[PDB]
């Protein structure tokens, strides 16, 4: 009930943090590749 909803909200926040870190890694790899090219 309440515990599942709270845990699912923190799962969503985990998804937010993971897509932010993956976007930062994406721009870092793209900047390294556009410096290499």
């Amino acid at each position: 009930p309440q515990l599942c909803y709270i845990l699912d909200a923190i799962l969503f926040l985990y998804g937010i943090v993971l897509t932010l870190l993956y976007c930062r890694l994406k721009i870092q790899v793209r900047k390294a590749d556009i410096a290499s090219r």
Partner: protein, 212 residues
């Protein structure tokens, strides 16, 4: 203060055409004019009294009703069902909580007396009464869930009401739970986005370990 409580007083969620019904908000015996916002069928009606007295119910007067008194919240919506039947099983509720009560009645068309009424639950009769009066089922259990109907005799003619499923539940179904399925769904895009932001991160890294 609290939420509004819209309440019929003839408390029958199923009425026939021409039945006088009155829609009361939070609840007193006073038609407090210009003090209640009435929403019928998700559209704000011009009736602003605390008592919405429908003196003759129309099929158009069915559907959803919400009251909101001045200084109060919007109500839990009640569903009137104005019907056009030879014999109607009136009920005070369609979903009843456990340890709760509900009345049923067997009404015919425009104050015609129903006589020799048999009330059935799932084709099994539980009560016979000549005068069509209240059958007050107090302290409802899961036994009291079922497809209730009633057979009556008209001015001399046997007619059978349409069945009506009255469900007894531990707690009300709250009809919007998939909204809490929005957030795990918005994980299975975002996490899947991560898989894209893994794969297109790996391949561009796979192309950067080859050049050295």
């Amino acid at each position: 203060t609290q939420k509004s409580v819209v309440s019929l007083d003839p408390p029958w969620i199923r009425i026939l055409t021409g039945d006088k019904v009155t829609l009361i908000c939070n609840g007193n015996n006073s038609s407090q004019m210009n003090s209640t916002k009435w929403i019928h069928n998700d559209s704000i009606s011009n009736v602003k009294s605390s008592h919405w007295v429908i003196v003759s119910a129309t099929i158009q007067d069915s559907g959803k009703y919400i009251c909101q008194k001045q200084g109060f919240y919007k109500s839990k919506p009640v569903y009137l069902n104005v019907m056009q039947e030879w014999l109607l099983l009136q009920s005070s509720a369609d979903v009843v909580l456990d340890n709760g009560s509900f009345d049923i009645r067997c009404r015919s068309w425009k104050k015609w007396k129903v006589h020799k009424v048999i009330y059935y639950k799932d084709d099994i009769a539980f009560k016979y009464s000549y005068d069509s009066n209240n059958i007050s089922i107090r302290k409802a259990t899961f036994n009291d869930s079922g497809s209730y109907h009633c057979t009556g005799y008209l001015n001399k003619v046997e007619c059978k009401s349409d069945k009506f499923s009255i469900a007894v539940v531990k707690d009300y179904t709250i009809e919007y739970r998939w909204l809490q399925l929005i957030f795990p769904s918005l994980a299975v895009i975002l996490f899947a986005v991560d898989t894209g932001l893994w794969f297109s991160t790996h391949k561009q890294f796979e192309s950067i370990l080859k050049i050295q």
